[PDB]
Amino acid sequence: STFTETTLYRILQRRFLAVQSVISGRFRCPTKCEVERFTATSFGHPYVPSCRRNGDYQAVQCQTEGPCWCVDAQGKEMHGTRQQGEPPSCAEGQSCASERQQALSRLYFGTSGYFSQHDCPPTIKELFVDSGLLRPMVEGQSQQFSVSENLLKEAIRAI
Amino acid sequence: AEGQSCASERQQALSRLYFGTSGYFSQHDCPPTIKELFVDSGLLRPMVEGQSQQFSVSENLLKEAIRAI
Amino acid sequence: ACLSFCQLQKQQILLSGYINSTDTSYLPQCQDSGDYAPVQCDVQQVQCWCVDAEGMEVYGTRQLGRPKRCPRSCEIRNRRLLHGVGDKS
Amino acid sequence: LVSIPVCNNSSVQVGCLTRERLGVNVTWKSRLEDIPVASLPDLHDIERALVGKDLLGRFTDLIQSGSFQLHLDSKTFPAETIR
Amino acid sequence: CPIIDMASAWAKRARGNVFMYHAPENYGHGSLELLADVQFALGLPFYPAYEGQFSLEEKSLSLKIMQYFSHFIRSGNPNYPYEFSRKVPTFATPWPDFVPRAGGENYKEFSELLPNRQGLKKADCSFWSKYISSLKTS
Amino acid sequence: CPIIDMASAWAKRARGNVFMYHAPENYGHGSLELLADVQFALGLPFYPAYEGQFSLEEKSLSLKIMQYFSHFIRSGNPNYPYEFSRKVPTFATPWPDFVPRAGGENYKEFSELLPNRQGLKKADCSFWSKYISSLKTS
Amino acid sequence: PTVGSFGFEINLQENQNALKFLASLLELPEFLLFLQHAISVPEDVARDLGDVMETVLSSQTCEQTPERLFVPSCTTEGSYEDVQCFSGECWCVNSWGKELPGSRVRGGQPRCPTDCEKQRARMQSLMGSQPAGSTLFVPACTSEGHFLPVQCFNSECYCVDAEGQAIPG
Amino acid sequence: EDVQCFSGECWCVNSWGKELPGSRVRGGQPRCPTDCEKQRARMQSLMGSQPAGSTLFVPACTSEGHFLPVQCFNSECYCVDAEGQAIPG
Amino acid sequence: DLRNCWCVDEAGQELEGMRSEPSKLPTCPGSCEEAKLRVLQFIRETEEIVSASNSSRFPLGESFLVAKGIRLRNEDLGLPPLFPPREAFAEQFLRGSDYAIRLAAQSTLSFYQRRRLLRSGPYMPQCDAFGSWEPVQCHAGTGHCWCVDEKGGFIPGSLTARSLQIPQ
Amino acid sequence: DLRNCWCVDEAGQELEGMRSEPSKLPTCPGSCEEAKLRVLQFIRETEEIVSASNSSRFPLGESFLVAKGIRLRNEDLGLPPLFPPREAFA
Ligand SMILES: *[C@@H]1O[C@H](CO)[C@@H](O)[C@H](O)[C@H]1NC(C)=O
Ligand SMILES: *[C@@H]1O[C@H](CO)[C@@H](O)[C@H](O)[C@H]1NC(C)=O
């Protein structure tokens, strides 16, 4: 219909981002985190952000020799935290307490197993990661890859 | 007493249950050196085994065979 | 915590209708994120239009009460191009 | 983290009562068709995730052990009690 | 060991999906000319002649096996009843296709849980296929 | 596979008692010219040079191994310190002798519990001894 | 070091080796069969094909869910604490969710492994990917998990502390 | 007695002192095997000491341990009771 | 009208709790009320071991030994063999794995909460007035309104987690 | 006579139950009395959970859940976190 879905366009963005891989280390354009980090480092003003190689914001973000807090994946402050001194611990792989609540609500569900049986996603553990399909990706001949897996999931996304 | 040796053996476990704490001795409370010399190490296997069913070898005859000989 | 650009304007209109005491029939309806909601109108809700995320009113989409969808940043720029403000691509 | 909005236009109401005490009855509310099971798998949780230290406990600690400064007509003034 | 290289040479053609099963040894009712994989597949526990001779577990196994062959004869894949709808198969375990490569070569074992094994007789189908294939030519 | 037929042809002579051990793979401290069976036997965890480099479990293992070789060099049997006293050996597990027959061929594995295994490399010492011994002569 | 299009670190030797691998990834019969099953992923579980690569690279660590009446034990702040019990057995876990294999003791509670075991079982496993005779340093330690006081490597034996650094002299 | 429990697992035993292997279930209590399982697992084990093709009668039964109502042998299928004797006719 | 007619389930097991007279008509539930009776009986013996917990008639280490598979007969402990109902607990703590692990967990909840909140209990399966299953089944406490057909059994897919409309 | 000298076992673990003054001599058992003290402490907490059994302060299903490896914190059950000594038993 328009110029977008033409094959003349999608070859150009693939030739653009493949050059951007050997230039920037990313198989993508820079996201909102990486632009804000560069413009803060350029003019030298405080509050430089932090980006954990995925393009998203790193969670706990401190400014220069001052207060510190944590941020979601959008650039906005979490209101229940501003801790002077040590950096906080915001959801850094702390998914047990949410998962503890699912087990207690399954514990207090009637009796006899009428439904409580039926309460990784489905059809992925037994099609992709077991059936020889992921094994070409995270494997090879030796150590000389250092293949970042926030680059391969950027490789399949942009291509 | 027709193979009713559990109730005697139940008393040995209860007296081991009520023996102090901490395992200072209670570890040290088939006979020894028979399970790992005779019935495992190929020595009994010539007796209760053969080529086929045509033995009916009574084992109150083999323990009478070694006794009288 | 400090105040978003919405709630800067929603206080500035409302006290101007309190200091001068002359009412203005518009106040924004921004969400929790601080930026504007796309649909914007007054308390009587008779003409609700789509707005840019920066704040300026998108010219043309003044419906009579409820936009089913609002134009986003491409389709505004893609159509104003086709009206002819430079950069024919 | 998932976002659950708990307020509306009808969350707060005011009125002068004894000529120097402007009361306010804040009413948080949140629809149950906003909170997934994977977020809060129990109605007991939606009690405790609301009355707990995140939302109600942090707010009581703001108005008790702190300060709160409203900004009207270039006049800054405190606004907290406990009742 | 022919049926492996029947599948693996067919799968390296990459012209169609390749699937493989393997029935276990089923000791009971050896009074039938059919064997332990066709009877689970062509509706034999439901026959009027074979009424009561099967349990409610071999019979319920032999309905998810009929769903395996039905979704294959309809769509060439025993997980999807059509060739244009790809919702999640919520009837049994999702069959993975025979990937003709090391780290793969998957199949399905027709037991009560229908599990996904990986590599059938890979010791012995390296014997007749790699040892003897050097002994016969040399 | 030589050491099996070294033992089994020696044991079918029936002239003396035949005993066999087998040390496991011991990954640690590969900085020694001696290996994992002699060091447990000739008092190496107690040496003044090797002070502290061993645990209190490899060291306590290497006292029941010294008792194994001592009761052999004294009496030809690693369960009895004399050739005329046959009380029960209450120091470790009773070593069974290498019975050169199917259902036997016992040995000792020098691990923490000192267990009695049965048949060392019987797959692989049927390979070099029964397969190739027909391939070499024919 | 290097500065790219922005404040980026460029190990260009690392970047060139990835694109050599990426061209070899597309020249495979078994990537086309990976891409066929990536189409058949539903929309809610994965929006884009990068989200297919998000779930698949994450599902390789998802062990099958335990018995339904099991409930984990968290810390004060919630940090998925060490000894993790169920009906008779307890075991020890990482910070992530899986359990350390072999640590499933029966009755009582296990000791979670110290700095020794998770250092030596790595280098016992790395010993299994070496040429024959090509040893490397395995920290041998006591049954209590504390280090043996004199570690050894390359025909050199040095004394250690309770932490891992060689004290000099 | 039959069900023999310990810390988490229970199992089932004979009259003599040993336990039936494979019956060590985890949690709750197992069902001790009926007249079916100790008859067929003998003749499944006796099937393993036969020539190839030389079948013999294995009593197949339900998951509840009760017999399948029509047992079969030597291309002859007969109905049974809940005990084992063939009812005539 | 001189015969005693009780009624059983499939495979002939008596629903104990009654015995008919020669001149009565036995009430017999079907397919939904048994799954409501057993839940009523589960809450019943939940309330039994919270009463003996209040009455202080058994040690606190009693359920630990039954969990570990150690059975003390009353002949061992000197007391008369039936003077407490001792073998009640060891029956109803060894009925199943998933059964007794909930029955303790429901009781320790119901002991402290009655001694002191949330209006949440277990799930009683609501039936119709005929005796069969209501086709919609809502669990207050979570928000799951699922559907059940044909003498029990969750039909797959039909689950609804916290919606405004009732699942038809 | 101004320093506080307690005493430990091997590998430096304090026998808790005391703290010395600047002008006292700490009694320190050896090798047989610890194995008599722990048995005295075992009979002590044997007599503790027979008192709470008499006092009726804990449910009868409490020890069943700790046996099965299910740990209920006091935050879950509405009650204040230290108002009973709940985590003594577990
Ligand atoms: C209206 O109120 C504003 C408040 O800032 C004031 O500055 C202004 O002088 C007033 N009058 C007019 C005519 O705008
Ligand atoms: C808040 O929103 C509701 C719903 O649109 C509306 O009825 C109400 O009038 C609004 N509040 C005010 C003060 O306008």
Ligand SMILES: *[C@@H]1O[C@H](CO)[C@@H](O)[C@H](O)[C@H]1NC(C)=O
């Ligand atoms: C809010 O609080 C006030 C003061 O306690 C009370 O009179 C009123 O009923 C409450 N509710 C509403 C809806 O205003």
Ligand SMILES: *[C@@H]1O[C@H](CO)[C@@H](O)[C@H](O)[C@H]1NC(C)=O
């Ligand atoms: C226990 O029983 C007493 C009477 O003996 C009663 O007053 C009390 O309410 C009961 N419940 C609790 C939790 O104490």
